[PDB]
Amino acid sequence: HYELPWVEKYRPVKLNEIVGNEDTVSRLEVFAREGNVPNIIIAGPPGTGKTTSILCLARALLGPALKDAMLELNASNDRGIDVVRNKIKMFAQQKVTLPKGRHKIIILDEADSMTDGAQQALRRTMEIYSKTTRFALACNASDKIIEPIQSRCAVLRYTKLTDAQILTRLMNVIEKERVPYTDDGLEAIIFTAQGDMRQALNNLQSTFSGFGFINSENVFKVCDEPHPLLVKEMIQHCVNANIDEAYKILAHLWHLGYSPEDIIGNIFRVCKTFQMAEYLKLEFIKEIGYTHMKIAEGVNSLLQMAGLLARLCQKTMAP
Amino acid sequence: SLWVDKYRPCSLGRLDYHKEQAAQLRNLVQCGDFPHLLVYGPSGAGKKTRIMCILRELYGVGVEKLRIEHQTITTPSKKKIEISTIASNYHLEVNPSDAGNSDRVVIQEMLKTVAQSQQLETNSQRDFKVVLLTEVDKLTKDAQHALRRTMEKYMSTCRLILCCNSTSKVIPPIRSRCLAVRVPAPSIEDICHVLSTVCKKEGLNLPSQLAHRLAEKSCRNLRKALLMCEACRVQQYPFTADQEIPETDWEVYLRETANAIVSQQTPQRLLEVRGRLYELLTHCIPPEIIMKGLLSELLHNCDGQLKGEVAQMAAYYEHRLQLGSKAIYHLEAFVAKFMALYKKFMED
Amino acid sequence: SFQRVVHVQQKDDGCCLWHLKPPSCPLLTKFKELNTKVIDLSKCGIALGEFSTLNSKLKSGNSAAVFMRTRKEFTEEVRNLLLEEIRWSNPEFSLKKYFPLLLKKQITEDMLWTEKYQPQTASELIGNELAIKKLHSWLKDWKRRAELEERQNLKGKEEESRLCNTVLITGPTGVGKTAAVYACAQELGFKIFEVNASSQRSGRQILSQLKEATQSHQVDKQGVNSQKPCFFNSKNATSLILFEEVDVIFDEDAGFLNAIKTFMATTKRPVILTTSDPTFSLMFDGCFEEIKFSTPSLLNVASYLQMICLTENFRTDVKDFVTLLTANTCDIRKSILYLQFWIRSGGGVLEERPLTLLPKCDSGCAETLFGLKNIFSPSEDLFSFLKHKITMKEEWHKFIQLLTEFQMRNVDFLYSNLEFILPLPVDTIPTTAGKKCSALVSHCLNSLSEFMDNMSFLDALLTDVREQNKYGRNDFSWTNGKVTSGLCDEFSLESNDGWTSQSSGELKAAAEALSFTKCSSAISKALETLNSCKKLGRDPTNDLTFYVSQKRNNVYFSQSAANLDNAWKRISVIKSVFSSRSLLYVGNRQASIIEYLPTLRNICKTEKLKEQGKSKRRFLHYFEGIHLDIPKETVNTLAADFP
Amino acid sequence: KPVPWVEKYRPKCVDEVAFQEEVVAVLKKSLEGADLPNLLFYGPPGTGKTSTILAAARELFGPELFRLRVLELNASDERGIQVVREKVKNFAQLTVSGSRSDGKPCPPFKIVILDEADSMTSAAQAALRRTMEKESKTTRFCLICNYVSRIIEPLTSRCSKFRFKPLSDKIQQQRLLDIAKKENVKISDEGIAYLVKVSEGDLRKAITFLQSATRLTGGKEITEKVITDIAGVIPAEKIDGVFAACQSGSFDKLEAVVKDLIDEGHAATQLVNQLHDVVVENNLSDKQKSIITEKLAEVDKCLADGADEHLQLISLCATVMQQLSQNC
Numbered sequence A: 001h002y003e004l005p006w007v008e009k010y011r012p013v014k015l016n017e018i019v020g021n022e023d024t025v026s027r028l029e030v031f032a033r034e035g036n037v038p039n040i041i042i043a044g045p046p047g048t049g050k051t052t053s054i055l056c057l058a059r060a061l062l063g064p065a066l067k068d069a070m071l072e073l074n075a076s077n078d079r080g081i082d083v084v085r086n087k088i089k090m091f092a093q094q095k096v097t098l099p100k101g102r103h104k105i106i107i108l109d110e111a112d113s114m115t116d117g118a119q120q121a122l123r124r125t126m127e128i129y130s131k132t133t134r135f136a137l138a139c140n141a142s143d144k145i146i147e148p149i150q151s152r153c154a155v156l157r158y159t160k161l162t163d164a165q166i167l168t169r170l171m172n173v174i175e176k177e178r179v180p181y182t183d184d185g186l187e188a189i190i191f192t193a194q195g196d197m198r199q200a201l202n203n204l205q206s207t208f209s210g211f212g213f214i215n216s217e218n219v220f221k222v223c224d225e226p227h228p229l230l231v232k233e234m235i236q237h238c239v240n241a242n243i244d245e246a247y248k249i250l251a252h253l254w255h256l257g258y259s260p261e262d263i264i265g266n267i268f269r270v271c272k273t274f275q276m277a278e279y280l281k282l283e284f285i286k287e288i289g290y291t292h293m294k295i296a297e298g299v300n301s302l303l304q305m306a307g308l309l310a311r312l313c314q315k316t317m318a319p
Numbered sequence B: 001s002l003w004v005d006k007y008r009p010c011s012l013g014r015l016d017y018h019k020e021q022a023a024q025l026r027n028l029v030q031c032g033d034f035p036h037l038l039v040y041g042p043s044g045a046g047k048k049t050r051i052m053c054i055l056r057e058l059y060g061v062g063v064e065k066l067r068i069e070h071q072t073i074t075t076p077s078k079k080k081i082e083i084s085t086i087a088s089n090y091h092l093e094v095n096p097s098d099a100g101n102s103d104r105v106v107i108q109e110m111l112k113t114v115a116q117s118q119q120l121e122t123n124s125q126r127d128f129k130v131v132l133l134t135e136v137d138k139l140t141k142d143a144q145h146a147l148r149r150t151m152e153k154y155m156s157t158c159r160l161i162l163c164c165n166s167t168s169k170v171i172p173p174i175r176s177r178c179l180a181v182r183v184p185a186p187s188i189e190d191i192c193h194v195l196s197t198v199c200k201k202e203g204l205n206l207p208s209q210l211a212h213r214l215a216e217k218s219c220r221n222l223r224k225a226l227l228m229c230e231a232c233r234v235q236q237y238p239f240t241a242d243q244e245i246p247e248t249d250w251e252v253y254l255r256e257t258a259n260a261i262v263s264q265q266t267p268q269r270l271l272e273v274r275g276r277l278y279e280l281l282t283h284c285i286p287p288e289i290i291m292k293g294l295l296s297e298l299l300h301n302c303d304g305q306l307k308g309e310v311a312q313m314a315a316y317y318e319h320r321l322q323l324g325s326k327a328i329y330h331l332e333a334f335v336a337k338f339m340a341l342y343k344k345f346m347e348d
Numbered sequence C: 001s002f003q004r005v006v007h008v009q010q011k012d013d014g015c016c017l018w019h020l021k022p023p024s025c026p027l028l029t030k031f032k033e034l035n036t037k038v039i040d041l042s043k044c045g046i047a048l049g050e051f052s053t054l055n056s057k058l059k060s061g062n063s064a065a066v067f068m069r070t071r072k073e074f075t076e077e078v079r080n081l082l083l084e085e086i087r088w089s090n091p092e093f094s095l096k097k098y099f100p101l102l103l104k105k106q107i108t109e110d111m112l113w114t115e116k117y118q119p120q121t122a123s124e125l126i127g128n129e130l131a132i133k134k135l136h137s138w139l140k141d142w143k144r145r146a147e148l149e150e151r152q153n154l155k156g157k158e159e160e161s162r163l164c165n166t167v168l169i170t171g172p173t174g175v176g177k178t179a180a181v182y183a184c185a186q187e188l189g190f191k192i193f194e195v196n197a198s199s200q201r202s203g204r205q206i207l208s209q210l211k212e213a214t215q216s217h218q219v220d221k222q223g224v225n226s227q228k229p230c231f232f233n234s235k236n237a238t239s240l241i242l243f244e245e246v247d248v249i250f251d252e253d254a255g256f257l258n259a260i261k262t263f264m265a266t267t268k269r270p271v272i273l274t275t276s277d278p279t280f281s282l283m284f285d286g287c288f289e290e291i292k293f294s295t296p297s298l299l300n301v302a303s304y305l306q307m308i309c310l311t312e313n314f315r316t317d318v319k320d321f322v323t324l325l326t327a328n329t330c331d332i333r334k335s336i337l338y339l340q341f342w343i344r345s346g347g348g349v350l351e352e353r354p355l356t357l358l359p360k361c362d363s364g365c366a367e368t369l370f371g372l373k374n375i376f377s378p379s380e381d382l383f384s385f386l387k388h389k390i391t392m393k394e395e396w397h398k399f400i401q402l403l404t405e406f407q408m409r410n411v412d413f414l415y416s417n418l419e420f421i422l423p424l425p426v427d428t429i430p431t432t433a434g435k436k437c438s439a440l441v442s443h444c445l446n447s448l449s450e451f452m453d454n455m456s457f458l459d460a461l462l463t464d465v466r467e468q469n470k471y472g473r474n475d476f477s478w479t480n481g482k483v484t485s486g487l488c489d490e491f492s493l494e495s496n497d498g499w500t501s502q503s504s505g506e507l508k509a510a511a512e513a514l515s516f517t518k519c520s521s522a523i524s525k526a527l528e529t530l531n532s533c534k535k536l537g538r539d540p541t542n543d544l545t546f547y548v549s550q551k552r553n554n555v556y557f558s559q560s561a562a563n564l565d566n567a568w569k570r571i572s573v574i575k576s577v578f579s580s581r582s583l584l585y586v587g588n589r590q591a592s593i594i595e596y597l598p599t600l601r602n603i604c605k606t607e608k609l610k611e612q613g614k615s616k617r618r619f620l621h622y623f624e625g626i627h628l629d630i631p632k633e634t635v636n637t638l639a640a641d642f643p
Numbered sequence D: 001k002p003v004p005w006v007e008k009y010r011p012k013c014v015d016e017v018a019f020q021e022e023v024v025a026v027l028k029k030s031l032e033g034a035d036l037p038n039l040l041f042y043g044p045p046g047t048g049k050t051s052t053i054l055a056a057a058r059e060l061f062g063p064e065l066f067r068l069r070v071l072e073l074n075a076s077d078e079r080g081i082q083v084v085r086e087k088v089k090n091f092a093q094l095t096v097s098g099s100r101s102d103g104k105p106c107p108p109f110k111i112v113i114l115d116e117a118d119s120m121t122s123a124a125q126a127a128l129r130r131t132m133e134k135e136s137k138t139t140r141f142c143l144i145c146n147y148v149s150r151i152i153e154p155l156t157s158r159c160s161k162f163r164f165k166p167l168s169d170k171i172q173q174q175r176l177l178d179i180a181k182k183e184n185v186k187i188s189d190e191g192i193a194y195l196v197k198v199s200e201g202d203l204r205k206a207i208t209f210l211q212s213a214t215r216l217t218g219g220k221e222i223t224e225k226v227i228t229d230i231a232g233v234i235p236a237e238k239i240d241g242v243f244a245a246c247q248s249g250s251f252d253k254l255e256a257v258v259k260d261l262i263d264e265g266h267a268a269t270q271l272v273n274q275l276h277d278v279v280v281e282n283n284l285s286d287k288q289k290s291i292i293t294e295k296l297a298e299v300d301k302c303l304a305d306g307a308d309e310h311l312q313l314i315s316l317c318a319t320v321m322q323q324l325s326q327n328c
């Protein structure tokens, strides 16, 4: 009777249902089929399928022994210095009868949030008990994991999902949910989720719950980004060196309540795929990056964005 | 113990130049409530020896002994940083610019411990301990704000001495409460006087022509003059008027780098110049010093209208070097833009 | 209450500025009427692929390439050929004395390769031969003392020796300190008692539970003795105490330094200290023998991993391993673990390369090490992708993803490998036609200068993902750089920004890719006209060559454009020179090196040149003649030359 | 033991201040009912805002309680706004009993002297707004700021705003002569005129400079040279030399002049300030003034970023030389 979220309802159960990062997913597939997986650290952007891949790997490796041979510790758990020295170490020393080539798995989700002292204690207990236990860590920024932890593991890299893969999984969810849609709504959902599959599924479910149909206006009504048509028109006006119309669009966006940050972010995202020459695109990207740095430093006014549009207009009006 | 520190004066009466300023600093000390000092001037001018003379005038002879201690301070981002420190019973000396953007992690904490020691140590000599701040011009904005709040908080507890080369980067709040002591570079005759006095105290005699040549080659740097005189002493037992003053190795390396820049303007030569600049950077030579030396050795071969453009380009890329992190990009960008401009000038 | 608020301004009568009116000039009176009418987005529908890389056509059969690799066991002949190939690759390596040991080690699996190929005998340690020689010798004297004690006990019923009861082993992570002490202990029959940071080690705990290991015998002297009981509290074998990672001190480890000092004073059995923090040897007080594991040679560890893969019936090239070890900064354990992951997954790619100096080779480990295989099709090479021009949106996204994956590490990929990927000849270091050739050379130089000005723009005026010089200053510094990681269990509670890193990396990657595309396209357009100059008879191709170092040519791609060994040596000799007692009290650091160091090198060079001419011996008494207590090898280092 | 003259020679009570008439009147009407509202003092620095409100607090509260019930805080804290938020929170959380022996019960509120209020971001000012409305009755705030227009809408709409118009040179010279005669330092009156010219209407900087000159000279005569060295002002002959080198059109003498100014220890920011003051008040053309002043602004920005004084000054002097030689 309860409405399960489509993020969890359509979660992959097998390792072959995971799109994107085909090389690392295939290597994890052959390790789940064979066994003797080493200690791994999967790093990448959010929403790309790291927790899903680790869970499917451990499920395929253990099966009925997943109930007792698996120890999962995410950021909602304690994972302190005493937790690392006691609970993880007794699970490492714990006797579990497993088939040959199968080891106990200690998943440490969100190892970025793990405290440095906890990792410093984790080093040796991950090193010595490797005959019977294995460690699978998942993180977003691998720099937050200290160097001996990365030395005691194998670091696997995940990238952003290509819009083709997000489109294929979106069609997979749509064809199992009776979701009416059009192509513009699909383009809007893919745009609102820049390389994230969780954002794509959440935006699809939110647009289906709010309006029941998938077109662009519905997606941007339920997600409320600055519209890429408006930003594309502003960039086109800056290409034609029309400061008046570009500032008209910018001031309309500013009076709609959008922050400087998402306005400059959408400007960069539209400018990344804009159809112009390579030199003009390079100057536009350089000026957008300079203005974005200025926004990040603290000075974020309409004067800064008006000065950008103008530096974009004078890129074309001047040689 | 070279000649630069064996004959460093220990009291304000033994200084040879800036004698009026030395008397003024003595009168400052005798008032009993001397303020935070902001000592500034060029390198080799004599700021550190005047600060040491002030410290020996304030306390007893016990400041002349020094000891090195290492302090490990926990950053609020939870990553401990360990720094070295020269200290005595009465004064501390620190350089927090070694801590990067965590310099405030020294500033808000280290002097606080000294303040703790000011309620722990009791000597009945003076009610403060002098904290010396070396290269305070290299601090950041928030580091200087931390320093401002620190001297506000522990005014009656400890006194501050800020030694720098340029007061351009320091904030006007940090200058509005410190007495400014400008120590200009000594003149040529003053360097000749110091060189003759240091040679007589060692038992040697050097001619006036050689001393004048050393003073002119030092570019009004007394420490560089003393080091070059010691090198000339190493080279020859007697001092002759035509004795060749030996040159700095990285300076002549920079000179051949400038000659290689001028000689040919090709991508291959650009790569060798990049390799030479990397070799200089690996020798811990600061990149601002490399930029200044490159501009100094490239303006000789330039023409009058080209000189202003080359100087403005060098200043532009040195500001970029200050803003950025990897200085080889800005160094070689200046270099390559200079070869492009020089080639365009030579074709016409 | 609700008092009133007033704005009191001392407005005196007059001054012509307090009461001001809008000016009567026509320029500032005819205000333009603001219009809010923007274009209507309801009529304009968004086509597919307008804001993304979406194509109506989809590739089928090119992806999902299952390996299904069944590696046959290599015969003796091809094993001998590959062993001779590695012999050719490493002439200084003694190949023959290492292979039978690994064959015995290998002769369904359930342990990691780090413990599968764990060196049981101390001679199997790669590199650091002086350190392992010192450790093996020192444990020989300690085993000799234990046997002498046993002989004295059975018969009953030390400045000259200078046998210090402890060594401190320091080095990088994973170079093999713990492996070396374990191998030596197995060779000499010691029994390791390991105290590590993974267990509770408070001072009274470690004292009251481990003094009797040092002060007494072992009850079980025969049988199962050479084991490793890790201390915790939730032939005759001599006990040995090992302290792994002594630099890691917690608040729960109360008085651990005092406890290990009490161990230091009152022990009768050898004690090893293992750490990777270089500051600890200066922080800890007491008498200990210093042993330093330097970073091992890249070719030796590369041939060792080639041995490891050859035993597992895998044939590889030494260049891929050199790239992997350069990326892993010569971490042996990290390289072994990633090699295990990459081999047991089925290798990189099936490619054939004929080398005499046969099964297909397996190059491509460093490409999948950085996750570049997750972006590219498995028929695409990285440099082949970089050399050709880029036009279609999908491989533009591939380039952007490559650069932003390399930008999260704050590593500059296109700058570090600029020569090898620009369309220009690269060589390792050992008239109107002239106007046209000079014009082409000037065009190439202008494109290069514009590109590197753009790169300086990126480095200075754009946000970086990781905050540079966060805890120390910038690169190539001598004053510090020993920023150890955190040691406390409380959280950071910082106010960092996450949007301005994820967007910043994409922005920097996009700008770098666009600038490199512009520079490469301009250089290729300039080199299109090289045929006319070659027909004219003048060849500026030499003026167009790139002269790179030999060590940079040994890799598929480099992580940096500098020499790290050189820089580490320079900073090391700077600390060595200025650690002298007379020079410890120099206040500044910048002018200290800038002025003190070159005249010191000048005096050293003059002293060496005076001694080369057969002068009097008193000329070697200048430095210690004025009490410059500086070590002699650093004096010989300063006296060589200035590079 | 001793205290510098700038705080110890302030006005003790209200109406002892000078050159303010309406401010003192409304302040006295506030002290009459013992009801001091939220205050916003804006004006040039050293005009006497802090002295005035400290005098008002000494009028309102007893001197043994005046130090206890006021708290001087600074808004340019680099650790964020939550630090000063919790500082004022636990300063107003404590309720220490106090009384006056003169026969008047003390008002219950406390005083927070929050200076540099115009250096706060809009979010920090909003956090301050929520803190002020939280402590609406237990403590009434004051904000010392340079400009009233930097303070955001909800704070400025509720605190009474007072402008402190700057003191003239004559009243400042009279006050400085008072300080000199009362502190027993012998300094000629043209030196005091030089002091009020150098400090540029900053009476607090003038008092600090006079104290530093008194305790640095040693009771002898304070010449203009000692004041010039204390204040960091570059003497005008160096500025004239810079301008003559630029007007000559030769780069080598320009380099020599810049090197002579650099090795004398003179700051580059002070030189940029004095060149700007010279340039904006000359008979130069408007385009020359525009180009030179824009270059001075970018050079000031580059010097704040830590660029080398020598390179920035030689680039600025090259720009000035080009501007002064393109017309001749």
Ligand SMILES: Nc1ncnc2c1ncn2[C@@H]1O[C@H](COP(=O)(O)OP(=O)(O)OP(O)(O)=S)[C@@H](O)[C@H]1O
Residues within 6 Å of the ligand: A006, A007, A008, A010, A011, A012, A017, A018, A019, A020, A045, A046, A047, A048, A049, A050, A051, A052, A053, A139, A140, A169, A197, A198, A201
């Ligand atoms: N590659 C993928 N293929 C298919 N579905 C995916 C993929 N990645 C994410 N999803 C979907 O998105 C949900 C969330 O994915 P997660 O694996 O939890 O993301 P993540 O890799 O853990 O990133 P984090 O947790 O933010 S660091 C899954 O339950 C799936 O429904």
Ligand SMILES: Nc1ncnc2c1ncn2[C@@H]1O[C@H](COP(=O)(O)OP(=O)(O)OP(O)(O)=S)[C@@H](O)[C@H]1O
Residues within 6 Å of the ligand: A148, A151, C113, C114, C115, C117, C118, C119, C124, C125, C126, C127, C172, C173, C174, C175, C176, C177, C178, C179, C180, C275, C276, C332, C333, C336
């Ligand atoms: N020189 C080497 N020769 C052979 N195997 C090595 C070598 N160095 C490391 N290994 C392998 O890598 C594993 C880990 O080495 P360790 O000795 O634990 O590293 P470490 O020197 O202790 O540095 P830490 O402990 O990470 S700070 C060993 O058990 C070996 O399997």
Ligand SMILES: Nc1ncnc2c1ncn2[C@@H]1O[C@H](COP(=O)(O)OP(=O)(O)O)[C@@H](O)[C@H]1O
Residues within 6 Å of the ligand: B003, B004, B005, B007, B008, B009, B014, B015, B016, B017, B041, B042, B043, B044, B045, B046, B047, B048, B049, B050, B194, B222, B223, C591
């Ligand atoms: N009055 C003086 N008489 C003799 N030698 C001096 C005198 N003043 C300075 N020196 C020498 O000049 C050098 C100045 O160096 P230092 O005090 O570090 O100045 P800075 O900090 O500006 O470099 C010292 O080594 C000192 O030996």
Ligand SMILES: Nc1ncnc2c1ncn2[C@@H]1O[C@H](COP(=O)(O)OP(=O)(O)O)[C@@H](O)[C@H]1O
Residues within 6 Å of the ligand: D005, D006, D007, D009, D010, D011, D016, D017, D018, D019, D020, D044, D045, D046, D047, D048, D049, D050, D051, D052, D167, D203, D204, D207
């Ligand atoms: N109007 C005035 N009347 C009397 N003294 C004044 C006046 N203005 C300034 N002063 C003196 O000048 C100094 C200015 O200090 P301060 O009140 O902090 O200035 P501000 O508050 O304007 O920054 C005080 O020591 C004070 O004695």
Ligand SMILES: [Mg+2]
Residues within 6 Å of the ligand: A050, A051, A052, A109
């Ligand atoms: Mg997850």
Ligand SMILES: [Mg+2]
Residues within 6 Å of the ligand: C177, C178, C244, C245, C274
């Ligand atoms: Mg170890």
